[PDB]
Amino acid sequence: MILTITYTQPPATDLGYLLHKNPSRPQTFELNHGKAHIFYPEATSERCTVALLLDIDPIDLGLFDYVNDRPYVSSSFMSVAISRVFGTAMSGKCKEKPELAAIKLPLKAKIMMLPCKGGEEIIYRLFEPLGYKVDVEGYMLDEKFPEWGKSRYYTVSLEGEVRVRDLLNHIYVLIPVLDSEKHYWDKLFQHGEGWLVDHPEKELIT
């Protein structure tokens, strides 16, 4: 349910200009079935981190159609929030730093609680062709009860040098590919421009 992005090229607060959310101005955006908060846990010249926080309403609607993991996972609602808070930043448009927006920046990202039926392997297959160094962490369903075994949640960390708009567009497209049951619960090629056609898993992504 959380996306973080981190930039460390001093003046790191320049990350704010590329995203257009002034680090001193936390904001809330309203989605279908909830809302989304954007704020900067850290904004110094040496380190700047943005945070995208889903606030999904469980009541907005079997017993488990009321008791589900929806409000706590990086589902397709994450993509929808991305296109809503970092709207323009995905169009490469930056003003006060037009060239920062122009070149590959050294960047890090973290997507929490990605529900992937396909596990680690499908996460790499989607992200490493795009030039990311990818780190994946898994979770046990309940540490009290190891006998229940692994969850199919994964938290994905991305480290790479890329344009801010590619990063946002990568995550926007690739997240709902892992969300197998989005059908239970926005146009493509305008978002995959530059990278999608050449991606090894493009049939699978489409």
Add this chain to the structure above:
Amino acid sequence: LGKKIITTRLMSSITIHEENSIAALEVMSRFAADPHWLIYLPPTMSPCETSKKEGMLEHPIEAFEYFRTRGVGKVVCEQKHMGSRAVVIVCKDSQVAEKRFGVLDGTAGICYTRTGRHFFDDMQLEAELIDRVRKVLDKSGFWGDFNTDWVCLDCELMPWSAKAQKLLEEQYSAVGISGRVVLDEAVKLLKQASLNKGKNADINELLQRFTERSEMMQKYVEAYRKYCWPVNSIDDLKLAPFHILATEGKVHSDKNHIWHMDTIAKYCTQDDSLIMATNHILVDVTDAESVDKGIKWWEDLTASGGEGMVVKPYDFIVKNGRELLQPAVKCRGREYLRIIYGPEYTMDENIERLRNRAVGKKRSLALREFSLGMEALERFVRNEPLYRVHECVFGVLALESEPVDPRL
């Protein structure tokens, strides 16, 4: 088929629609016990009206009112234990079973679920529990005192069934791990931003809000964990009968619930720790201090907290004139209900919208099923043939495939 019309002593006309009929045939024919044993299936039970006390969705006051305003001045409150519902039938021997039920596989007893299927996969475990119950009924003089070679019992069986305890893996813990991790990270992040500081948000409101969400999610996770412990042997089971339903020649739906409690304690719960007497009180719903006592009692049951209480009328079957009243109304524990209405149901903006719930359909379903099970007992005991008993039991199944709010 078409529509099946069933006639019962309590409701002369009960309709089984084709699509409910089919949906039942599917689950009765494929995975169910010997249809000879199925002389009764338990009904679904309605909850109370919603409370308006702070932080409360269900509270004992409304269950009491249900009976008081319908002219029932005395209720019996029984503890709901952390377990499935199971029907227990015990014969003295396989000869009784064969002669009285028509059971042909030499089984001398059965423990089945509300769907008409064996509570256990291990059939040996079933029979071991049955004879343990039988030994007790010997060591009390049940058979003699009741002039019967068999008994049908309505019971709580703990812990959760093996099928039921899988949901903890497939569902409850999934929500639990995902919710704990992200909500803890949400708090950490907001906190950092708090110290380093669409529409405008306030970071400290946000932090407080996500702090509350995180807390509710911790409680949820502590609520479901309790229902985990596996049945490695018979010493892991706990069984608490709450009705003696039928013995040879009699259905005990004329007996009040104090009778049921007391009579089960004398005959089924003495000198074995496997079969317990259930904790209960009697409440005069007309007296503020009897009512207050039942509330306190209920606050204590759910302090841990347990699931709550089942509130029953003093007599087994009661009417308000000719209108049959609910034979039971559950009042579930505040913590327990996170397992039903979700982790964050107690949060303000949520519990508020949840307070408007429609129970009409569910009550109507509980009454029709209640009638059909009584008819099924009354037919067996008066020695009607299989199909006449079975149409009532199957009727219960069919109504259960009717769409209703799963949380109710």
